[PDB]
Design a protein around this ligand. Sequence first.
Ligand SMILES: NC(=O)C1=CN([C@@H]2O[C@H](COP(=O)(O)OP(=O)(O)OC[C@H]3O[C@@H](n4cnc5c(N)ncnc54)[C@H](OP(=O)(O)O)[C@@H]3O)[C@@H](O)[C@H]2O)CCC1
Ligand SMILES: Cc1cc2nc3c(=O)[nH]c(=O)nc-3n(C[C@H](O)[C@H](O)[C@H](O)COP(=O)(O)O)c2cc1C
Length: 365
Amino acid sequence: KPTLFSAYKMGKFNLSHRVVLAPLTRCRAINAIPNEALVEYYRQRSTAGGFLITEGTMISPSSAGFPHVPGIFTKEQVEGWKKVVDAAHKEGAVIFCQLWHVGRASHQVYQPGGAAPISSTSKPISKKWEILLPDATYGTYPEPRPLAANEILEVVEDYRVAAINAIEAGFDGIEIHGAHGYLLDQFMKDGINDRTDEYGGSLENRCKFILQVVQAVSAAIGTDRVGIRISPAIDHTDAMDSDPRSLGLAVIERLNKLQFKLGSRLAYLHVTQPRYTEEEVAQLMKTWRGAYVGTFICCGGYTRELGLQAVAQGDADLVAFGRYFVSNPDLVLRLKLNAPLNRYDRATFYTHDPVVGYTDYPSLD
Ligand SMILES: NC(=O)C1=CN([C@@H]2O[C@H](COP(=O)(O)OP(=O)(O)OC[C@H]3O[C@@H](n4cnc5c(N)ncnc54)[C@H](OP(=O)(O)O)[C@@H]3O)[C@@H](O)[C@H]2O)CCC1
Ligand SMILES: Cc1cc2nc3c(=O)[nH]c(=O)nc-3n(C[C@H](O)[C@H](O)[C@H](O)COP(=O)(O)O)c2cc1C
């Protein structure tokens, strides 16, 4: 009988419990190289048969939209990741690298040559949102440059290469970051995508880019090593869709069709709970899970009780935790014990110290 703490076969991989480390950007990978701080951070959070998803990891120089986030497009970066992955595996973890391109959610200071960030559109994120800059001030999101069709294929290739590099580093698989208003979401969401070509308009056209990515990374490393993350019901950085239910089902129908065509299942579908800044929200997530053929990871506001309930009721197979994992390196143990959870200090979510607010939250002895 499925519970939050029971084993699960995630296709190729065996898990011993259903508690997942959600992907969390933390900005400790100085100059984009995974380092000793990241090794300790993921090692602290590793459990035997526990699934870990890394922080968003750059697939290219133009991918950058936060300071000191890791990449996986150079040999130096891959060598850094090897040390992280080896340590996690020594603890018996299964670990996926999240492949991340921010699209228009960037700034000239992050872009090679100070070029404009790339996107589906020329429309910037509106001024009511600001971007954290490398000098600890907040700046304005600039006007992005809309990709030409040939250029989109180049980014698909960047994803493909990043997936190969992740496997070279020893990762068990990768997660495609298709959520939270970043590049792939800038194509999916009709509040952003104003294109009139083959990548704009219909749900078919809007889902084209992310499906090309899923197809490319699956070709590179296998369907069973690929997860995909989406967030159809949000408004973060103006990433709204007029019909989140249908958008989510459109992605899911295409994932299902691809699985049927290729003859195998993706590792999982990962969806974050609707959020704009409640029971319809609950039902939406159940509708999406019900439609997807395969493993479903839920995330967003889950607690010990909500997580137990999600797995017991069949609403999800795995439950991811973000903010609680920041402050509770041994979150799985704490959940198993119903121990109090350490409060997290949001002030150090995105600072760059390898210890302070990163690896110095205590575990239980
Ligand atoms: N994909 C990526 O690379 C990352 C996407 N992330 C997502 O972007 C959005 C904005 O992130 P943020 O860190 O700038 O702000 P946020 O997490 O939304 O928190 C802002 C305020 O909302 C509050 N809030 C009340 N409900 C909640 C709730 N369900 N969840 C996240 N906060 C909440 C939250 O309370 P806490 O400090 O977490 O207790 C805080 O007061 C979030 O949806 C986040 O999940 C952040 C950065 C990079
Ligand atoms: C500091 C911080 C960094 C995050 N980084 C990522 C990220 O790199 N990729 C991603 O898909 N989501 C990211 N998220 C969203 C989280 O994965 C997660 O969905 C969110 O924290 C909600 O789950 P929770 O209620 O358990 O915190 C981040 C969230 C926070 C607070």
